[PDB]
Design a protein around this nucleic acid. Structure first.
Lengths: 185, 200, 50, 321, 68, 1109
RNA sequence: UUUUUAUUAAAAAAUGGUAUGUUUUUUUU
RNA sequence: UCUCUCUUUGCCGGCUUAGAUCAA
């Protein structure tokens, strides 16, 4: 239906649509992607796609900054994220990884994930995951949406400006016919 | 009449179907069809006009002046709805249909709606006394049990999760809400109410 | 280059669109009182629990 | 599986827990070439409750053909026949009342006139055979013969699931009949033999050639069946009025009539609320009076098939006599 | 005034106060009643200046229509 | 001017066009652009390539848009002078923008505008302004650190810990996997989410996703419970939350839109937390609202609780009572999230506390604006009700102190009642007698001795010296001006000082970092030897308590006066005078105003339903308070009149004659609008000189809504039981039920129905709720009243019944006699139907008929995409049906003014224009129906003469070929069927078809003719006997007459009421033939039949239930 | 202590709902 | 001084509630 896993083609069409349209026309961008909603497109752009996100490995300075902030403001990742420099989901996942790593290094020499163990694993948030690599024949509906997107990105010329040029062409054809009739007369 | 080009509909069900077009144009006509014009052009008359026929009565010339009939004064909508509104007779269908008889209690009081079929059973020599039933009827009970709800065989389900005045309309596009229910209520007398409650 | 509209097509690369904002000039820092606040709260929590 | 309702003359596809025998067959299917394991998604306590063997189709189908068979053999009392399992009497009675109102049985329940025996000799159902047998009085057996052959053979149109749906629609777009699917089927059948039995033509027009061949075999055997009664089979209607074909059909589908309601549904003569199937051409034409053949019922809507329009005064004159 | 006021002039020989604005109309305020009494209408666009002739009973206004 | 324009031309060139309030913005833009071009052309030096104006204008527009969206707009390469000039002009434009927003919002609040567009524009402007301010506030919070200092936080945490351990509170655990009540809490949450939507097709993408998720949860619940618990344990970052404001025209409500799955998880957590907390006794009975009472019962409980205090009204020794109402000023905005998290970890599990705290730190986005919420508290979350209710239990301990809170609440194992103490020793040991927090409003009752009051005033005046006696100038901010003075507070110096001192002390009790008390929201009312009336305003009620001791006056014990009894002496000691607050009156007025201007107000039925719901929601909340308030009576009159005026205008004629009360107030099943009425009453009047200073008796009555003629439209309030009577009956019924339950428990019987038939639907929690099918699931729905009230921050649709739930309280009002009483008032069913087109339908009797809501054609197009004109027509169709039903009264002859114009090719006379009626009547006669009917009637008339073709006057009989335009012309009529006699007869004055004692031997006549003319009668004039008599006496007596015979016969047909009559000279045989033949005709003509069915289809009025059925 | 008097309204046009734009020659030499 | 090519080369639709909305 709607949603999914953000295949690489969808991410690329999102980047091109932001190139051509801007960051304040998410409904128009989401018209390109049949399987996604404007909220989902905006969420992916602001959570994964936009170039401002630093997807590189964690430097040590930002790691200690993250530790200090996570101590200062318990929870509250949406405000920790701007100060750290990464996104909120990145900060939360990094903090959880540090806690799990400390527990693993603790086990060699010897937090209650048992509460988190009593249930299943955390279901990953769809918009924050890396895009699925595309298959050689990535089905066929994607080709259809790619063709529509390609026609969309370069169409330009407005919508109803196609009437005036056509009318000029028809007038040129009719005047050419009139002149040709006169010369054959 | 070529039924118009039928390719226009294609798929695209109701909520994306453009608008009905009387003459391949987007426009309603008729007072009760949504148009701001009714009749010919907001008028009673017609394109050609209308004249009464000549009259002459001399006890032999009025014989050519016959009476008046239903069809001669109606139009295409009127005839269409006259055909639509003709429902009567039936009779024979109603006598041999529906639920003739079943279960011992109904045989006694309820009239056997089978009627002529009782004579047919006389032809079969039913002589049932105690009636005979078949496990299909236990499957006919399945017509009144469930169709399953995508659950497992042993799933016991839960009892909290199963669920099942007039005037003019507010407008078909104006929807429903807390606003549009009967303020005057006297329904649900006791079927929603218990007859007793445990005290302990 | 506007975040809102452009009547013609004129695709603009992401570097120019990104560079056109005052996000950098608006500083991102946190006051020093948050530290003292959090330490006091954690200490009183531990003391009250014990 | 499928269950038919005599009270409503419908059929519905319902989910049922499998029988014990099916469970053993499913378990034993794996393991043919090497050792295999089965994982049945329930508990043995659940297995302890299902009924052992699925009921017969003689107990889960339409018995109207069966009663014709016994009456043709000469069995006055159906109870005398040695049934392996007694069929439900109420179903037998539904079939018998249907046959009586159909005219194949008299007030005494015996076959009526040459009509009854001739219907008994027919392989098809008594409802469809009536049109063929009464077509001799009107000299138009051929088009009714084609209609019956198309109906018994099955669906003669092919609906692709890909983008070819528009192409299939345009291919059929030449043969949209204002009067319903039945005359549309007649036109398709008439022009099918008129295209040299070209298989490429059948592909191009999205027409099921296999169904048409099977209809050809059915009609040939029914021609032999009519010739058994010395009925000529060169009778065609030279006039475009399909009205008398419709008289024969209304004699054949007396019970299956309905008229449009304001809510978009149709009231069967038997007071049943039905909805038109999307496949039929007359999906939204709002035809005042309609006539169908088969009813398939879903959990909320009862759907009808083989849609054909009719006029009220035909029904009135037919019912009055 | 509907838009910005761009020019005022207190007549030294009448108890009047003329004003003009980018709303294209010139008003004559009667300072004895504090109410507008006269309207001077012809101006295709906003009016940017207003001056009163020292001797005659005449006033001059100039605006965006390139016309005084 | 017309002739000059005809002979001259437009002269359009060279003319100016004034700015007319629609060109203001588009002209202000031109002037600003020209000014910026001028400045550009100036600041650029010579020879610097002047071709740069357009780009600078684009930069200016972008800067303006960035300012509107609160974005920095910092451009790298722009030269400094251009940047400075752009900033200057942007600031100018922004100041203009803000000034216009201020002005228009004030105008909207007053009520001077009715534009839908202006309201929407101003809502957008205010949303942008508030969001800019809020973003700045969050930035300042991050900059300036936590406003609550470390010392304050430590003190708050310590006092909360000590309070919790004093009650031995057991912390809420994480919901285990094996939890008995999981399905019940889940189903309750799912029902409350579904209550928002309906079966309509207006569900957008988010609403459709919500419905799909709810259906999936019902179909398969257990993995949904598992998913909910998994997200509670693991998820800590959430999607953005949309923010918008809902316009109340006097304040704006912020509505938070949350994601579907997160909504489900929040709802389950809400239900679980509220159920667990109630079981563990977390909230100490002074937090409100509660499941125990609706707000009116809460007001009643304070009247009674105030009256039951020991020696409360005694003032012999200088004791004083101060009842301070106040609002915690900005307390939702100041919920420090980290302190909130640490506090919440005390109440519940660390995982639940972390989830609830991190759920409040979201990203709020309105359009292109967006900011992160890191300081305040988001009220749109489902569990936000619980979160606020215990953070406000913390403020309660700050205001009260731990000892007084423990005294008030009582022991944990044996909690006190609402406003009762364990004993008088504890009750009188502290000045604070009563306390109650209603969400964010605080009500405290103080009881001072002489020394305590004097010491408090002395302390207050030591720090706040008052040399000029300025404490009296601004004490009551016009709050209690509703009361007549001598019933307000008397501004004695000592009492004013005492009230201000109490406010000063209580305000000093609260840290400024987390809340404050504003004097403009606080009114401490003092009762002492000087002023006798205790005054307070709770919820929407204004209350004045006057003890019997201080009365010294006699007044009528009105319906709106509550008798306060004393539990010690079992006798009435005080009276509480109840009336609606000015805020409530304004709220109802604004509610009607937004009903009038909305999308759905197009159809008459919808606006009638809107009015009914609003009126019921008002009159059932303020039951007798709305009666004691003389402002609501006139407001109700005014607003009901304009609700009727909307219907009048939509028909393009607001003449009062056209719309008798039967059109509006007849029940829906009869074709009327079914409007409830409350403004058809006399408004009492008293002398205005002595009305603002004393309560004078009602000496005069001013009429309310006027009903033309003698009509008594029943009042809605007369079918609503007043609150005091309902409370008394409630107490009685619940006491007797308790005794009957005891006497059924003492034996081994089972309490049953038909044992309570006497008290079946009585008691504020109706007795019906005991024997309810869904009474086992509802035992786990807890904290529902607070949740229902908080639902206003989640949904954009206003909830009328926010104070009650039919599931828990029962149907508190039963309005069914209103139908029968208003049918009798309007004149019965026959009197009502006299106004309609019922007779034209030809239906025999009214009992079987019914209406069809939709025409099917409407149903088909209810989803298809349509043009605005087509949508307009679909909305107009029911109005057309309604107008056709009430045609005889709307198209009535007795009108004040209106040009009398005939409908073409038709005999209907139309007064006015009324386009809807005209189009309906055109449709009813869409072919040449009128003249066809006239010919088919004369044809059926001739055939019956061809039968009786051998009688008197049979010498000649001929029906002339009349002029085609004779049927629809009432200036004169040409001839019809002709009769000339072969002999001479004696006839007398022409007579009706009714007399048998008729003399026919007066004159000697020979010949007669018979003619028929058609009439479409109206309500005012439809007696066809007089019509035909006068018509015959006119047409025959007229000097010119195309009638051959000097005398004859005239018959008339009334198409609207299908009656008939005749007036003409009679011969034996002729009269019986017409008497027998007309009746057979009028049931058999094709013309009359087709008219009747085409009317029937236009009305959608069908016959009885199927005759087969 | 006997009696009273007090009576708002009110219909037409455009928005608004059979868009619009096009469209026929007497000289050459 | 011609011809060809390259390189350097300063360079030449507006407004409002983002107007409002959007499931095969």
């Amino acid at each position: 239906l709607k949603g999914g896993a953000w295949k690489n083609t969808e991410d690329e069409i999102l980047k091109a649509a932001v190139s051509k349209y801007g960051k304040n026309q998410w409904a128009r961008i989401s018209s390109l992607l049949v399987r996604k909603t404007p909220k989902q497109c905006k969420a992916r752009w602001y959570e994964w796609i936009d170039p401002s996100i630093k997807k590189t490995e964690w430097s040590r300075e930002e790691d200690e900054k993250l530790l200090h902030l996570a101590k200062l403001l318990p929870t509250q990742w949406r405000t920790i994220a701007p100060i750290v420099g990464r996104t909120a989901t990145q900060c939360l996942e990094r903090y959880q990884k540090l806690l799990d790593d400390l527990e693993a290094k603790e086990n060699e020499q010897l937090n209650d994930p048992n509460s988190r163990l009593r249930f299943g694993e955390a279901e990953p948030n769809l918009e924050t995951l890396p895009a699925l690599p595309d298959a050689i024949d990535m089905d066929e509906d994607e080709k259809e949406m790619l063709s529509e997107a390609r026609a969309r990105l370069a169409n330009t010329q407005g919508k109803k400006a196609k009437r005036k040029d056509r009318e000029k062409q028809l007038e040129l054809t009719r005047r050419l016919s009139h002149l040709q009739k006169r010369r054959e007369l | 009449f070529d039924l118009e080009p039928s390719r226009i509909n294609q798929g695209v069900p109701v909520w994306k179907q453009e608008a009905r077009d009387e003459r391949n144009r987007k426009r309603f006509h008729g007072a009760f069809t949504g148009g701001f014009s009714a009749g010919y052009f907001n008028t009673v008359g017609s394109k050609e006009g209308w004249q009464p026929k000549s009259w002459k009565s001399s006890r032999n010339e009025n014989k050519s002046v016959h009476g008046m009939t239903i069809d001669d004064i109606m139009d295409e909508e009127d005839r269409a709805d006259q055909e639509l509104s003709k429902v009567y007779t039936s009779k024979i269908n109603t006598i041999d249909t529906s639920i003739p008889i079943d279960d011992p209690l109904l045989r006694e009081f309820s009239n056997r709606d089978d009627s002529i079929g009782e004579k047919m059973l006389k032809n079969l020599g039913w002589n049932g006394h105690d009636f005979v039933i078949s496990p299909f009827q236990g499957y006919y009970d399945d017509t009144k049990l469930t169709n399953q709800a995508y659950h497992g065989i042993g799933y016991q389900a839960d009892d909290v999760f199963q669920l099942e005045r007039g005037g003019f309309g507010s407008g078909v596009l104006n929807d429903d809400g807390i606003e549009d229910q009967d303020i005057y209520d006297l329904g649900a007398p006791k079927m929603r109410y218990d007859k007793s409650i445990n005290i302990t | 280059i506007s975040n809102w509209k452009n009547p013609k097509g004129y695709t603009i690369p992401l570097d120019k669109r990104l560079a056109a904002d005052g996000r950098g000039l608006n500083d991102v820092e946190i006051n020093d009182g948050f530290a003292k606040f959090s330490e006091a709260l954690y200490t009183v929590e531990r003391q009250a629990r014990e | 599986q499928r269950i038919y309702n005599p009270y409503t003359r419908t059929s519905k596809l319902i989910n049922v827990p499998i029988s014990k025998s099916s469970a053993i067959q499913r378990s034993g299917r794996a393991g043919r070439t090497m050792r295999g394991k089965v994982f049945r998604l329930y508990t043995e306590k659940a297995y302890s409750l299902m009924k052992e063997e699925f009921e017969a189709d003689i107990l889960n189908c339409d018995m109207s053909p069966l009663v014709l068979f016994l009456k043709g053999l000469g069995l006055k009392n159906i109870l005398q026949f040695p049934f392996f399992v007694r069929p439900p009497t109420v179903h037998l009675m539904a079939a018998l009342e249907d046959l009586y109102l159909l005219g194949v049985l008299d007030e005494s329940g015996n076959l009526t006139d040459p009509l009854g025996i001739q219907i008994s000799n027919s392989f098809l159902d008594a409802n469809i055979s009536k049109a063929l047998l009464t077509s001799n009085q009107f000299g138009c057996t051929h088009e009714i013969l084609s209609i019956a052959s198309i109906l018994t053979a099955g669906e003669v149109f092919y609906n692709p699931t890909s983008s070819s749906k528009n192409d299939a629609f345009v291919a059929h777009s030449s043969f949209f009949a204002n009067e319903g699917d039945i005359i549309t089927a007649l036109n398709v059948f008439e022009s099918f033999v008129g295209n040299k039995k070209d298989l490429q033509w059948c592909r191009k027009n999205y027409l099921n050639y296999q169904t048409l061949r099977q209809a050809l075999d059915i009609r040939t055997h029914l021609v032999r069946f009519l010739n058994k009664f010395s009925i000529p089979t060169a009778q065609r209607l030279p006039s475009s009025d399909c009205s008398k074909i419709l008289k024969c059909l209304l004699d054949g589908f007396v019970r299956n009539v309905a008229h449009l309601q304001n809510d978009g549904s149709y009231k069967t003569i038997g007071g049943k609320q039905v909805w038109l199937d999307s496949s039929s051409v007359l999906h939204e034409k709002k035809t005042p009076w309609i006539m169908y053949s088969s009813a398939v019922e879903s959990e909320t809507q009862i759907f009808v098939k083989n849609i054909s329009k009719i006029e009220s005064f035909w029904l009135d004159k037919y019912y009055k006599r | 005034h509907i838009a910005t006021v761009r020019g005022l002039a207190v007549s030294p020989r009448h108890p009047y106060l003329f004003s003009c604005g980018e709303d294209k109309m010139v008003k004559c305020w009667d300072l004895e009643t504090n109410k507008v009494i006269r309207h001077y209408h012809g101006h295709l666009s906003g009016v940017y200046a207003l001056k009163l002739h020292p001797t005659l009973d005449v006033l001059v206004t100039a605006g965006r229509d390139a016309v005084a | 001017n017309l002739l000059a324009r005809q002979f001259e031309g437009r002269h359009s060139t060279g003319v100016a066009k004034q700015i007319t309030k629609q060109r203001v913005d588009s002209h202000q833009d031109l002037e600003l652009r020209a000014a910026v071009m001028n400045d550009i052309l100036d600041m650029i030096p010579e020879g610097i390539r002047q071709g740069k104006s357009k780009t600078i204008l684009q930069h200016l527009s972008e800067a303006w848009r960035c300012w509107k969206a609160n974005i920095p707009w910092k451009v790298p390469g722009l030269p400094a002078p251009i940047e400075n000039m752009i900033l200057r002009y942007v600031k100018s434009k922004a100041d203009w923008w803000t000034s216009v927003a201020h002005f228009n919002r004030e105008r909207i609040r007053r009520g001077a505008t009715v534009d839908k567009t202006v309201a929407k524009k101003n809502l957008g402007r205010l949303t942008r302004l508030w969001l800019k301010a809020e973003q700045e506030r969050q930035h300042n919070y991050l900059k300036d650190g936590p406003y609550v200092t470390a010392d304050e936080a430590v003190a708050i945490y310590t006092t909360f810990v000590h309070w919790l351990e004093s009650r031995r509170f057991q912390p809420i655990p994480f919901p285990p996997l094996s939890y008995k009540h999981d399905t019940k809490l889940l189903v309750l949450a799912l029902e409350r989410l579904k209550e928002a939507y309906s079966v309509k097709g207006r569900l957008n993408q988010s609403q459709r996703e919500e419905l799909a998720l709810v259906e999936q949860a019902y179909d398969n619940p257990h993995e949904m419970l598992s998913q909910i618990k998994r997200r509670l344990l693991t998820m800590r970052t959430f999607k953005e939350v949309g923010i918008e404001f809902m316009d109340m025209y006097s304040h704006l409500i912020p509505v938070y839109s949350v994601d579907p799955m997160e909504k489900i998880c929040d709802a389950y957590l809400d239900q679980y937390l509220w159920f667990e907390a109630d079981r563990r006794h977390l909230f100490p009975s002074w937090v409100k609202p509660s499941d125990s009472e609706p707000p009116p019962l809460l007001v009643y409980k304070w009247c009674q609780g105030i009256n039951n205090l020991t020696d409360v009204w005694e003032t012999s020794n200088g004791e004083c009572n101060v009842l301070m109402e106040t609002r915690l000023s900005k307390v939702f905005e100041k919920v420090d999230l980290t302190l909130l998290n640490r506090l919440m970890s005390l109440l519940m599990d660390t995982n639940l506390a972390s989830y609830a705290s991190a759920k409040n730190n979201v990203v709020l986005s309105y359009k292109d604006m967006s900011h992160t919420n890191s300081y305040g508290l988001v009220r749109g979350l489902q569990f936000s009700s619980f979160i606020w209710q215990f953070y406000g239990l913390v403020l309660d301990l700050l205001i009260l102190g731990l000892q007084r809170a423990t005294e008030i609440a009582g022991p944990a194992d044996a909690p006190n009642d609402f406003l009762h103490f364990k004993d008088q020793a504890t009750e009188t040991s502290h000045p604070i007698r009563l306390y109650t927090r209603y969400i964010d409003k605080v009500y405290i009752m103080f009881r001072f001795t002489d020394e305590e009051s004097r010491d408090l005033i002395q302390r207050f005046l030591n720090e706040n010296p008052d040399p000029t006696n300025s404490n009296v100038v601004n004490y009551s901010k016009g709050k209690k001006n509703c009361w007549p003075r001598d019933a307000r507070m008397r501004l004695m110096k000592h009492d004013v000082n005492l009230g201000r001192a109490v406010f000063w002390e209580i305000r000093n009790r609260l840290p400024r970092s987390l809340t404050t008390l504003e004097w403009e929201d606080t009114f401490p009312s003092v009762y002492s030897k000087d002023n006798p009336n205790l005054l307070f305003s709770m919820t929407g009620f204004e209350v004045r308590i006057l003890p019997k001791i201080r009365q010294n006056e006699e007044f009528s014990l009105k319906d709106g006066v509550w008798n306060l009894t004393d539990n010690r002496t079992k006798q009435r000691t005080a009276q509480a005078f109840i009336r609606v607050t000015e805020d409530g009156i304004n709220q109802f007025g604004n509610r009607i105003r937004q009903i009038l201007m909305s999308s759905g107000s197009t159809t008459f039925t919808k606006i009638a339903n809107k009015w009914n719901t609003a009126l019921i929601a008002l009159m059932t909340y303020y039951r007798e308070a709305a009666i004691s308030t003389p402002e609501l009576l006139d407001l109700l009159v005014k607003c009901e009149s304009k609700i009727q005026t909307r219907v009048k205008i939509s028909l393009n004629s607001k003449m009062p004659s056209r719309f008798p009360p039967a059109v509006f107030y007849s029940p829906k099943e009869l074709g009327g609008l079914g409007m409830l009425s409350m403004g058809h009453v006399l408004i009492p009047q008293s002398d205005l000189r002595w009305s603002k200073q004393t309560d004078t008796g009602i000496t005069h009555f001013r009429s309310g809504m006027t009903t033309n003629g003698e009509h008594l439209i029943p009042n809605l309030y007369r079918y609503i039981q007043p609150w005091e009577s309902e409370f008394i009956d409630s107490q009685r019924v619940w006491a007797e039920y308790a005794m009957k339950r005891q006497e059924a428990l003492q034996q081994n019987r089972r309490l049953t129905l038909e044992d309570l038939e006497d008290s079946w639907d009585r008691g504020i929690p109706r007795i019906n709720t005991l024997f309810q099918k869904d009474r086992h699931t509802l035992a786990y729905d807890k904290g529902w009243r607070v949740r229902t009230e908080f639902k206003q921050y989640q949904l954009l649709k206003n909830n009328p019944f926010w104070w009650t739930s039919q599931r828990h309280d029962g149907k508190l009002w039963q309005l069914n006699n209103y139908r029968v009483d208003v049918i009798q008032a309007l004149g019965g069913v026959e009197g009502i139907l006299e106004h309609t087109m019922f007779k034209a339908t030809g239906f025999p009797s009214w009992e079987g008929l019914f209406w069809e809501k939709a025409s099917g054609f409407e149903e088909s197009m209810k989803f298809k995409k349509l043009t605005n004109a087509q949508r307009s027509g679909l909305n107009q169709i029911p109005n057309r049906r309604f107008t056709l039903w009430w045609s005889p009264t709307i198209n009535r002859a007795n009108v004040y003014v209106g040009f009398q114009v005939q409908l073409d090719l038709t005999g209907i006379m139309m007064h006015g224009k009324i386009p809807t009626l005209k189009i309906s009547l055109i449709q009813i006669f869409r072919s040449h129906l009128w003249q066809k009917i006239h010919e088919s009637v004369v044809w059926d008339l001739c055939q019956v003469l061809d039968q009786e073709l051998e009688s008197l006057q049979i010498e000649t009989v001929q029906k002339e070929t009349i002029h085609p335009r004779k049927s629809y012309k009432m200036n004169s009529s040409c001839a019809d069927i002709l009769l000339l006699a072969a002999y001479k007869w004696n006839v007398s004055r022409p007579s009706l078809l009714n007399d048998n004692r008729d003399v026919l031997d007066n004159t000697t006549t020979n010949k007669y003719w018979i003619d028929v003319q058609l009439r479409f009668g109206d309500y005012d004039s439809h007696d066809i006997e007089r019509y035909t008599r006068a018509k015959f006496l006119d047409y025959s007596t007229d000097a010119q007459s195309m009638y051959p015979s000097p005398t004859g016969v005239l018959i008339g047909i009334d198409l609207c009421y299908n009656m008939h009559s005749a007036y003409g000279n009679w011969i034996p045989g002729m009269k019986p033939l017409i008497q027998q033949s007309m009746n057979k005709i009028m049931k058999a003509n094709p013309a009359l039949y087709v008219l009747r069915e085409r009317i029937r289809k236009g009305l959608q009025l069908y016959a009885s239930e199927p005759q087969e059925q």
